[PDB]
Ligand binder design. Structure first.
Ligand SMILES: O=C(CN1CCCC1)Nc1ccc(F)cc1
Lengths: 412, 412
């Protein structure tokens, strides 16, 4: 048997806001967080825009001196994590610290730090490399620094599954609790890949929208004029908690995490199969994990990256899994507004999926002006749709054909 | 209810050999894999040696067409994975491909690739960044590429827990099988951090031995004259398999994986606590997980990095866990010979722990000329020690205070 897992705390940095409620307010108003990237010369680049975190003050969380030791992706992960733990009301004690762990991931990790240290290395040789280069750049330092700051002695790890990281982090954290290896986990992801290497790297793959004249219209999942994803920064963190532990201290419970699916496409390094066979297996795995019939799903927060092949693969996958119910559920891509936070995408979209359940509203797919061939599902074009949502799925599909699906249900 | 997990296949690139048997021959003869680094100019660096993989031919495993797209850590991870899968005799089919997954991790991933593309960006601009920069550099692409080439549709993910990565990867892969999420997992890790940023970055932290004039004597775990770890390259992969699945196909079983522990130190970003409190908590979690009396432990493959603080912390942890039995078990650090493979350290050491069980021999801690204050256990100084080994433990500890322990025992 298995213990039940609930969500008692959430935290976020996104292109829409410096916390969950500001981010969610933008989501429900169909606001874009996409803009030309500032304080960085992108003249030589084919993409000049993305989703930046605007006005982040790390000194709300850390001393300037401790913040100087950490890449921006670690700062963003710690910000989301501290928010989530504060939002949970959890009190860490000598009696429970061994039962409280962390799994905060990243898809690409410390590119900005690597970039700045390469500069030192190439210009001035190796002796000018920061002593904090390694610990301040490696992906497991959000889990590390959080555990040290809060005295958490539970399972301490980090996932890195590219664009699936945040979904895998939350799912495997839920497993740790379900199987009695922890009572509480802080889980999610963070990303800051808006440097030359990130914009240049995805740019060299021709993976990015180049709609420089209209950045807010660039991310247009399932629209016939989409031309690739929009690179975005930020972080999401959830406090996952065993139900009886949450009830005992009188925690406010947002929702229950009832299912987690994983699958590998085993198809291509960067492209999904056109029929979405991998995403279909993964969703079926998640629904079997939750003991739910496909008919019980009301809302899907799609991966919905605004790539030609990715968006059409997800329609095919949903039709395959849900058959005569595929049109009854609502499915939207919040990436139409946030852009693609890569390893944090699954973390912020899990939060949006939980809030869709709290507020009984499907977030919109903005910019869906002309649905493409076969994109005839309820994709919540343009504006939020209030509706009954008992069960919400959040899907992530990443490089290496790695898939994750989370199943949340209303808790009462 | 929880299923049993056995080791049916193993694969390796190390500084001592291009497979498991050649590496193991080196381990049992007390041979050093450490040498001045030849693949770049280190005259400006404070450390100019490490454990390189010698004579690796990627065309033994991959088309030169596919190989050119991939960082060395991915090439090394794939080589070790391919070796492990062949060694297992497992046939991948439509009937079992959804039940076979992969969890190959890395501490740092494609730092060489990122450095080389950073050089291109800075000297020549963004249009010279490789189209393969992202899929060729990010940590989950061992798992990704392995799944694509072999058609593995099971759980597909990657851990990154710095120097604990290989141990966590194997333990969590075993949990996957234990809990029924897969029947087979390929799990381990790979690392190639021997670039300017890697040697420069660890150099800036003063974490590396600077014994440039005697590289084979540099790695001296528990010796009073130790002055930091030696940076080494390679990969370990194990095929983990549910017991009844292995029995049903006539698999050769090397050993049983009975125990896995994790803990966080919650102490310091980089330094372990002097008293080994976190390591002790981890080992106790693993021994309880395996249903063992601590007196059943015969051999410990120590983390044993040859750092002042790390080595003495491990003695303190072992004395705390084992009390008087600490003087009866054998404990050795194969890092004395291989150096520190970082994310791959736990993967190769798990393999050395399994072969310790197969061959009933404790590998030596070479260079242990003058054991330091309190290092008065059987550390198997200088020469391999044939002895009864029913239960073997492999420990890893990393940046962020992240600890892992695996417990293996003989299978009949
Ligand atoms: O293991 C080797 C070759 N060995 C390594 C050192 C001496 C000879 N090759 C290999 C194994 C599996 C596979 F799928 C493809 C190639």
């Amino acid at each position: 048997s298995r213990r039940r897992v609930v969500i008692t705390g959430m935290g976020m940095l996104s292109p829409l806001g410096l916390d969950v409620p500001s981010s969610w307010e933008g989501i429900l108003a169909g606001r874009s967080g996409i803009a030309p990237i500032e304080h960085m010369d992108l003249s030589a680049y084919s993409t000049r825009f993305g989703g930046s975190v605007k006005g982040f003050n790390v000194e709300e969380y850390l001393s300037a001196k401790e913040a100087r030791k950490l890449d921006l992706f670690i700062q963003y992960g710690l910000a989301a994590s501290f928010q989530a733990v504060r939002d949970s009301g959890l009190e860490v004690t000598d009696a429970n610290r061994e039962r409280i762990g962390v799994s905060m991931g990243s898809g690409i990790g410390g590119l900005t730090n690597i970039e700045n240290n390469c500069r030192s290395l190439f210009e001035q040789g190796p002796r000018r490399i920061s002593p904090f280069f390694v610990p301040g750049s490696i992906i497991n330092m959000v889990s590390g620094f959080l555990s040290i700051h809060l005295g958490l002695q539970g399972p301490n790890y980090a996932l890195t599954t590219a664009q699936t990281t945040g979904t895998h982090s939350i799912g495997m954290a839920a497993r740790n609790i379900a199987y009695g290896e922890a009572d509480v986990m802080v889980a999610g992801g963070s990303e800051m890949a808006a440097c030359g290497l990130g914009l240049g790297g995805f740019g060299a793959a021709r993976a990015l929208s180049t709609r420089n004249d209209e950045p807010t219209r660039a991310s247009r999942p399932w629209d016939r004029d989409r031309d690739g994803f929009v690179l975005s920064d930020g972080s999401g963190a959830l406090v996952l908690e065993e139900l009886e532990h949450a009830r005992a201290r009188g925690a406010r419970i947002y929702a229950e995490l009832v299912g987690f699916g994983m699958s590998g496409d085993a198809f291509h390094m960067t492209a999904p199969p056109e029929d979405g066979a991998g995403a279909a297996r993964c969703m079926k795995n998640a629904l079997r994990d939750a003991g739910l019939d496909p008919r019980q799903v009301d809302y899907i927060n799609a991966h919905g990256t605004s790539t030609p092949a990715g968006d059409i693969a997800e329609i095919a996958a949903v039709k395959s899994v849900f058959g005569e119910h595929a049109h009854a559920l609502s499915m939207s891509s919040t990436k139409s507004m946030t852009g693609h936070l890569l390893g944090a995408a699954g973390a912020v979209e899990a939060i949006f999926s939980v809030l869709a359940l709290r507020d009984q509203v499907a977030p919109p797919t903005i910019n869906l002006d002309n649905p493409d061939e076969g994109c005839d599902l309820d994709l919540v074009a343009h504006e939020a749709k209030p509706r009954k949502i008992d069960v919400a799925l959040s899907n992530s599909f990443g490089f290496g054909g790695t898939n994750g699906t989370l199943v949340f249900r209303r808790f009462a």
